[PDB]
Design a protein around this ligand. Sequence first.
Ligand SMILES: *[C@@H]1O[C@H](CO)[C@@H](O)[C@H](O)[C@H]1NC(C)=O
Lengths: 48, 49
Amino acid sequence: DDFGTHYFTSGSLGGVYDLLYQFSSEELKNSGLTEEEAKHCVRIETKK
Amino acid sequence: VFSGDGKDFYRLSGNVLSYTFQVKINNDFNYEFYNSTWSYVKHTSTEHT
Ligand SMILES: *[C@@H]1O[C@H](CO)[C@@H](O)[C@H](O)[C@H]1NC(C)=O
């Protein structure tokens, strides 16, 4: 446990790195329009 | 101890078993951005004659 089971006879030594990125985006639009117009008129006339 | 990613030299001891010169660094990031917008408009007009 202190010294191990194997030892390095031949090999390599160098550097390495890694990068991971995650991006998300959401866009939502909503519009509403409601128009109502009403006009009513009456006229009566009588003469005798 | 040989100079690895540090000063000119370093001295170890018998009780110390090992010294390492392997520089490994990690990082993590979690950035967020949002926006919630509301717009309600109402109008009315009544005329009687
Ligand atoms: C609305 O969202 C955009 C998105 O980047 C942000 O830049 C802006 O500051 C927000 N406006 C607010 C929350 O009033």
